[PDB]
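Subject: Predicted fold for Proto-oncogene tyrosine-protein kinase Src, 263 residues

User T.R. writes:
Posting the sequence so we have a shared reference for the thread.
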Amino acid sequence: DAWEIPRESLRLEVKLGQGCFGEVWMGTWNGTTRVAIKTLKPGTMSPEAFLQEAQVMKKLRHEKLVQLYAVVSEEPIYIVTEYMSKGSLLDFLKGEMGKYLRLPQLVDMAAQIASGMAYVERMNYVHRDLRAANILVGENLVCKVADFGLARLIPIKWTAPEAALYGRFTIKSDVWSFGILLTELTTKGRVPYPGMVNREVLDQVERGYRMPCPPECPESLHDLMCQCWRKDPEERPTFEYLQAFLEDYFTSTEPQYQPGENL
Ligand SMILES: Nc1ncnc2c1cnn2CC1CCNCC1
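User M.O. replies:
I've generated the structure tokens; pasting them so everyone works from the same file.
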């Protein structure tokens, strides 16, 4: 790969996370470009298994997908990507900033993530783990889809039933997850299905249960969520449709919107 860079060119500065996969750092590339750097522990995971997230990232390029910059392919492995200054969308919604986010910023964020996924749709990829913990936020409220560790070319509260039960993962099961993501945005990052354990969630959703309209969220936005949660996967809307609806929301759908205490 022309993706390869020399080890001298990477300076790992501040640690940002741990795991069984390894760890993630903020750093510099070529002493100029700020970057996110992902480490594998040479022992714990397969080298080929860790490198697969990068393999898929080489083919995909879009302004709302976190961009690969470089790799170090030999053990110890490093994966260099663009640095997203504000952490995961989940931490952003739950944190100091969440207090001031109102519906117009939240729906814009939704529109951006929809655009990223529309690209994934057009390329015939599936993400399979779309949720606020796997979206990253940059300067100026930019949201980008991250973490294609599971993403192929054909977490039960975020997973569509047909996927969780029978392994049928498609772009339409991603659309379900997007519905769940809309509730994370509109509740400031609260865990979906509050007070329900996982075993209870599978049961309920199979029997037709769906989350109610979150406090102060317009019913038209809840109705979009319910479209993303249709039992029949092929009756769920496309990411191209969702992008456009969200982009146009405040003119076409909710032109009379007024600010409230939380949304
Ligand atoms: N590209 C990135 N920029 C900034 N932080 C990052 C990344 C990639 N991963 N991380 C670490 C976050 C830290 C918050 N929890 C989700 C993972």
